[PDB]
Amino acid sequence: KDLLNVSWLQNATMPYFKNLQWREIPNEYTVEISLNWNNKNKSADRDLHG
């Protein structure tokens, strides 16, 4: 009742979830998710110029 849980494989085999509240989202609806695409690997020890 008024909750929708969706599931999707984030990496190649690990299932992530999302609990969308259901009645007040629009008719068509896209869910953005955070996803590493071209993220610069930043150390916990170096600045911009390293």
């Binding site: 990496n11 190649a12 690990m14």
Partner: protein, 231 residues
């Protein structure tokens, strides 16, 4: 299914490895993007894909510690004078080994290395070793956790390749041996759990230039053990 088909590669495939227990394949080529796939018989996908600029990698492999099995360090190396270690933790933290302590004049490259366990044999601090090739007759055994030069070994004549053979001693003790060849094809077989000094040496029946030596049957680099008694 073609294991590159989900996210393809562009250069050649100069290194290809498996995780020792987890269902994971590693692919590494000259386009300096080491990918890792989750592989299965139907549709196999890309778990992560690390890219590292300015370092076209030649050989790269998985490694787990024998003691507590929760390390999962990739090691990768190309034609340059630095190699990289990685503790994989499902944003990555990778270290760049370049500190050559004893010998600094024998590596024009890091492009051939193996990884191998060893015991301490007075205590039992079972730990890793990177084994890098050199240029004259040099192959240097480092540490895998720290990065210290453990020692080195030079054979007479040009190194072409080498491999690692373990053997059990007691219930809980074992001994590692390094096998190395020339192009001429007379091999040195020396243990390196004590200091690296030759305990056997013989000669292959033939070959003018031999290219590649590989040991197998028991455990090795490609089939590693998990418990120390399982070696």
């Amino acid at each position: 299914k073609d294991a590159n088909a989900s996210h393809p590669s562009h250069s050649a495939i100069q290194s290809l490895s498996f995780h020792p227990s987890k269902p994971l394949l590693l692919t590494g080529g000259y386009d300096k993007t080491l990918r890792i796939y989750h592989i299965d018989g139907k549709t196999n996908h890309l778990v992560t894909s690390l890219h590292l600029v300015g370092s076209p990698i030649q050989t790269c492999t998985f490694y787990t510690s024998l003691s507590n099995q929760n390390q999962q360090n990739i090691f990768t190396a190309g034609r340059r004078r630095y190699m990289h270690s990685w503790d994989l933790s499902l944003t990555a933290k990778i270290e760049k080994f370049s500190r050559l302590y004893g010998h600094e004049s024998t590596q024009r490259s890091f492009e051939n290395f193996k990884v191998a366990h060893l015991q301490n044999s007075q205590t039992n601090s079972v730990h890793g070793i990177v084994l890098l090739q050199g240029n004259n007759g040099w192959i240097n055994i480092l540490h895998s956790t720290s990065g210290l030069w453990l020692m080195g070994c030079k054979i007479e004549g040009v190194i072409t390749d080498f491999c690692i053979d373990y053997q059990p001693i007691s219930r809980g003790k074992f001994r590692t041996i390094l096998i190395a060849v020339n192009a001429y094809g007379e091999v040195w077989e020396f243990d390196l759990n004590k200091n690296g000094h030759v305990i056997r040496r013989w000669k292959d029946q033939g070959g003018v230039g031999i290219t590649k030596i590989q040991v197998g049957g028991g455990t090795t680099t490609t089939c590693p053990a998990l418990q120390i008694s399982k070696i």
